[PDB]
Amino acid sequence: GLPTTTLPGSGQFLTTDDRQSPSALPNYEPTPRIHIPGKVHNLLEIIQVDTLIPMNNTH
Amino acid sequence: GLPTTTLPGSGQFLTTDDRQSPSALPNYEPTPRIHIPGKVHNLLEIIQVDTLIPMNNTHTKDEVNSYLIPLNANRQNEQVFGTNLFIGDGVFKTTLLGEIVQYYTHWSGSLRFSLMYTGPALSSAKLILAYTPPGARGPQDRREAMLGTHVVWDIGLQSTIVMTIPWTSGVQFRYTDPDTYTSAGFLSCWYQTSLILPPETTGQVYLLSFISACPDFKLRLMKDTQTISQTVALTE
Amino acid sequence: GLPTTTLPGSGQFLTTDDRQSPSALPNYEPTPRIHIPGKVHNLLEIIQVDTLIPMNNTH
Amino acid sequence: GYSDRVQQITLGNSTITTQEAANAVVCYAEWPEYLPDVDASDVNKTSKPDTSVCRFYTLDSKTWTTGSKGWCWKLPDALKDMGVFGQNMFFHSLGRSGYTVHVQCNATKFHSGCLLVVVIPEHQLASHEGGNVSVKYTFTHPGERGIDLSSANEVGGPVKDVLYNMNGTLLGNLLIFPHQFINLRTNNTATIVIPYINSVPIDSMTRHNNVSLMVIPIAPLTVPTGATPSLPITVTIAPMCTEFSGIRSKSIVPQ
Amino acid sequence: INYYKDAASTSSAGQSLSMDPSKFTEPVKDLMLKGAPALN
Amino acid sequence: INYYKDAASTSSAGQSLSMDPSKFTEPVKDLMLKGAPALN
Amino acid sequence: INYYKDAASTSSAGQSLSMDPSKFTEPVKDLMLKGAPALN
Amino acid sequence: TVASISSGPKHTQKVPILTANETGATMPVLPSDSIETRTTYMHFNGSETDVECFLGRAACVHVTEIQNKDATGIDNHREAKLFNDWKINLSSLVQLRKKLELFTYVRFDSEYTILATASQPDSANYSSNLVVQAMYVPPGAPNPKEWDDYTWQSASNPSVFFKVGDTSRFSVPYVGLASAYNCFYDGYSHDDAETQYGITVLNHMGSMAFRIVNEHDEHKTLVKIRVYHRAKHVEAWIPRAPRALPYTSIGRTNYPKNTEPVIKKRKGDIKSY
Amino acid sequence: TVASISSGPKHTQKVPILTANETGATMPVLPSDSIETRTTYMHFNGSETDVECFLGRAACVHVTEIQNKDATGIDNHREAKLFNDWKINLSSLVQLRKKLELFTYVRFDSEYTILATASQPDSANYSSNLVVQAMYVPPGAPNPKEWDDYTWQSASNPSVFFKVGDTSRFSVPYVGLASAYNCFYDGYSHDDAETQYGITVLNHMGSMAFRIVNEHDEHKTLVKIRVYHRAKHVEAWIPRAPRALPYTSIGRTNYPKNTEPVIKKRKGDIKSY
Amino acid sequence: TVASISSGPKHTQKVPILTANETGATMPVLPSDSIETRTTYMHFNGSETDVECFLGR
């Protein structure tokens, strides 16, 4: 038995933390990926495509 | 599953502990630093800059005048000012030195006390500043004063005189909040000869006095300052 | 997140255990030691000095 | 035969000579310099009028009398109307600058008096009303006139109490800011070089002042017998390494 | 260190650091050079 | 050992051990030597 | 393994294993040999 | 390191103790320039006066309170403390504030600890176990209106759920818009004749909102939230004079009128000890 | 290691058993100087008599008590035990005190454990869960006046928050002003004719204050605090005679008048067994 | 990485700002194609806009 101390924050759930978890479906094999045109990696990729501005807002 | 045991103290929150925490904002990129003159790294850097001491504390409401130590022409043998050296209280207390010392419990080191003369250029004066180490009373006359640490100051072209209160102590640390065992002495100043004004001139002349710490100085065991408090939370 | 199990005795306070603790005064510098004659290391050092026995206990 | 005492500063088309100086202070030991690329953000090339803006402007003179409490000027405000410096100021969106400040006050070897000349980076003033009353714009933009600490409280203006630096701190501790004394017996001028100090690389010159220059009598003026009881104090200031960026239409500011 | 056997149980992935907007911003068949005329 | 990915999540920094009061105590333009006259 | 930065936070010290009673049991100025007469 | 060197009698033309303070310098004079000293060592590093250490311990920055009670018929949850929000800000409780305002610009990462304890001031059979959900809510962020709005879904906004009686702890990177946070700002948000003044126009981290996730039990439960803040990775520029008068407002320098003399008057003369 | 060597008959001019105790020495005489012995080994190191071991286990040094109750209309929180402070000090409970005073000067680091348990002596529906906040308060430190003063912000003063029923544990470096703590001090704080005497003028670590963070429930709850202290990294100088009479005061050597004979009288003669 | 390069006056036959949006492209025009710029660096990677980050809380 190794001695430990727990710190403030133990047991909290922070929606933004990133840790490991047990898989509920041990050993399951996902469907293979096939190729699909159009993959997005960054939202910065798409905000460089121009779109129309409803400038004439007066309606 | 690795076997563990939790010790006493688990779950406590100690405001002074230093550990890692998850970031709430994963992957966020802070603004770049640009250069800004003036970076401070240690409070020890700043307590070496001297600031004015309201030595003339005798007023009744805070005034620019309690920074001015007056001098009288033609007095001989007499005493210009006196103070004990409880740097955390009394005259010292509002100075930057006094103000920082109050964030710590213990101090040790030498102090630098200087006086800048502001009288007409055609006047002259010789003063004696004396440091009295712990153990004797505040000196009562120059004879008594002159037997301890002292500097005869001759007022000249060079306007300021820097007296050092060298660390004289049995115990290697003193308390910043005034206490006896730990007390540091007295500082007094007397006419050595006397102030003399030129013709066509009259009245009082004043000395400005500063305090800063020597590079010698140590402060330790941080705590809360008696210099600030509040009764309800502030709002916008 | 690494999986753990806590054993019997968790949370107990044993006045005789010897472990690490956080310092309440982070970074504080203690007064230097100076030399003092007389250091004791073991109680076995001192019980070898002889002392008087109130043998005449009859008072 | 160089003395700490005599000095000449030539900047642009203007020169100052002092024969009774007491060295010069360079804030935080740094000398004004232009904005490096590594620190840049705005993509605009900046404009550096050089000698037409980096010369010495002498503000109107003040009069130290035995009752004076002290005066306060803000930068770049104090210069908002000086020559082309000022025009550039109202015409660009952003600008940046360092300064040489030269405060002048001469008397004779029978006078006494001592002024503190200090530069305070980001001097946020307090309302004399207390609470959370704000200090209106006009009040913190006195222009070349500066603020006269012995003038009366006004409404929407700052507090003018000297033992508190106009902000809740004691006069005695102003010495932690770059400063120099003018002690009639020693000194006759004070000179401070101010590098640009901000938390952003360049800023607006009209909505934010980045230093207040403050001249405060501390040992009262004492003139020789039957002398006139007052001396003028003059402040001359020169922008140095000035850069303007984001030119356009020309700001319109309150009052 | 993964403590678990399955890949789904590992933490979040790490930045694509891929980034290529041209499939979205310039899907034209004949290449357009900036500075050259759009329509020749 | 950092257990977390972001730098903000690490513990306190470690002593500057920088320390140079001269920007505050001696910001004069012409260097003053202790022992030499202040004003020449 | 120390988990903490300060020395006060470490566990108990480890045995002096110093042990020298002579400062207490034989602080005499001229050395006494067992077996030789106490007072000569 | 030597704290003092050995120095003996002097009869020179070289006087280190005469200076001209008008210059603005504090000449580095030592005991050995004016008395005869002996060698002594420092034995000390100045570790605990590092600014990281000075600003690096948790300070209480905010105490708020929310209650768990039947919201049935409450027209204004916010007003019933069914949930409460905090215009985030670090200069409201005053101990930490004086410490930070020793500097003009400051830059650091924050570590927050949130302690929540419950009170049941009037007759309850028991103490319930409530889960708090404090969620960050930055500017231009749909604001919660009821204690159970879509807002609380917080799909893009970091939120932490912990139990009353426990503590929550997480750390946020330096979120300032500029290179440092301004402890002071002698400016306006624009050249308006009536716009506000000072730091409040710059410190605009938005706000933090708390609520209990639990529905109501038969009694009412008061939960009081205390937020602690610890600076880590500190960087501070341009020291200033310490605060002397009391504070009146978040973000302005203003002091109260008819305040009291802050310098202690002597009981005696200038000459007194 | 041999505990005894083998030694046989002796008929010498060299007598190790005759000495002169007037000299102040304890001559190192052994069984083998006066009887015939056989070899035997020690099999032992003297591990558990090391001073680190002797002073190194936790001892109870203080029991105090505070209560959680409605402070409404209480004119003196301190007096209602709404919070209670402890003039810190290590010679009040007596078991550990006799152990330390076997030495004149002592130097070590302290590890504190604080156990807090609650009592509800009069009718309660339940047991509430209270968080204690003990905060260090050194000399010249604004002192808490109410149980919820600005003091408790403790922005610069180390404080720990733990739950009643649990334990808190932290360790403080050796905070003495000198090189060691004086277990005894035959002096004064100054040459005053009426100043106090002994150690109390030297042991001046200031004090430790406790409070409950929780507001009040409908019943009252008594929380009793026990502070345990363990010396780690011990260094002790100059052994002294053990304490024989009972103690009367923290910090003075004084014993009670008409105390009882401390040496057990024989039931019989000097000659008795 | 540079966010903007330095660029000065232009008087060309090569106009990067005239395009034909009918083509469906968004031509990659920059500040330096139409005003005079100074060098500046990005100081930023676009970390927190990665889709793993966007959908990962």
Ligand SMILES: Cc1cc(CCCCCCCOc2ccc(C3=NCCO3)cc2)on1
């Ligand atoms: C002077 C001065 C300096 C400063 C800095 C203030 C900035 C502090 C506010 C920023 C904290 O940002 C948050 C990040 C995350 C969360 C949060 N995550 C989960 C719950 O709350 C809350 C606040 O303020 N005044």
Ligand SMILES: Cc1cc(CCCCCCCOc2ccc(C3=NCCO3)cc2)on1
């Ligand atoms: C003989 C003899 C020797 C001694 C030593 C007494 C010193 C012990 C007091 C110092 C303990 O200092 C503290 C440090 C931290 C805390 C604390 N941190 C969080 C809560 O309390 C309390 C006390 O006393 N008598």
